[PDB]
Amino acid sequence: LEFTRLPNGLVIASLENYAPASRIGLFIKAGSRYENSNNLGTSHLLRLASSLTTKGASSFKITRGIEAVGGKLSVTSTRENMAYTVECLRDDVDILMEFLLNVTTAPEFRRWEVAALQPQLRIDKAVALQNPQAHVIENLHAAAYRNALANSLYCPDYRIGKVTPVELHDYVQNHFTSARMALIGLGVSHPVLKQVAEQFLNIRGAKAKYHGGEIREQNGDSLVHAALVAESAAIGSAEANAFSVLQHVLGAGPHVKRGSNATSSLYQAVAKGVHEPFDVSAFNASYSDSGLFGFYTISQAASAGDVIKAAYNQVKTIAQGNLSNPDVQAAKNKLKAGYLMSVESSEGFLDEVGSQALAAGSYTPPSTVLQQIDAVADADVINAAKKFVSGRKSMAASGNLGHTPFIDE
């Protein structure tokens, strides 16, 4: 894997695997943390502002020029980042390259194309919330954190019909910048990408103050969704991995289809006394400024706090030193697996390559990652839970709430 850097702060990498499917991803720091109060719900639009007018091309031609070669134009976007992933066959990379940069480098963002594209937000906003997690989970950030990460990916209602194109040019000119970008590629040689950026990309927010908050949503939905967390640590620190191993100690979701998750100390701990369905697992998030850690609950209405008061107790058992080593090494082996299994795919591989290139300025091959996992201390896995229990708390939930308690309860 090549890995370089220009004087302009613009990273490049490349991995000529001699594969058929070329693939490019342009990881950028443009997540909605960089939004202020007045420009909210913007990245939700910008994430769809792809396939619009440029200078070097029109919206129409790009829509067809890709489907002729049969490629793609997908867009991942996080609270930190904003990726422009693509796909194609290696025989026509030169064309699709030009289509990409014109989106990022010469977008006009005219008036009328936007107005047709705004009400799309009402659709996209609701497709997620058919999957009810995606307003519970936003509320955590909006409950715990205040300014940057509190800003959701998606767009509030009222913002629709009020967005300005000028409001983007300020956003674009400030954040699609040669100092904080990463022109990753794949299935492609390195000098090519070195030639592209020097011609076209040759151009030039606050912290996540944790506070402790709480949000509630009596929505009438029959089932419950809830989450309790604490202030975690940011990535880079080995303390971060101490949570990500604790994740697997505690519960990481079903490795087994229809599995009773017996090894998971949490779901096992609720299996007693309860005699009805429920589903629950660890919650681990790790951003640049900070992270978040906790769990995510599913149950019936009357059986919310009856379940949570196992979890909030189960973690205290860990913090009180009660623990064994094989569960840890088991949990490590889970962690060591899911990393490689995530990057087994080129896409999931790509998802890791530049994400390090932005937070760090270096790629860590997986072998070195496993050694840092090998060097983890049980006295840090404890703290960890001690930081969780002893730390300030933030909470959110939805569903019916006839029997949902608060933090202090």
């Binding site: 994430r47 769809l48 792809s50 396939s51 829509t63 890709i66 489907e67 793609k72 134009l73 997908s74 867009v75 991942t76 976007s77 996080t78 996209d124 497709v127 997620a128 999957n131 997690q133 995606a134 989970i137 990916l153 998606y154 979701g253 697992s281 919650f283 681990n284 998030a285 995510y296």
Partner: peptide, 16 residues
């Protein structure tokens, strides 16, 4: 889970 959005021109919309 660490949720992430995903749309496209031809990949169906998704939620990580």
């Amino acid at each position: 889970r660490p949720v992430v959005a995903s749309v496209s021109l031809n990949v169906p919309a998704s939620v990580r």
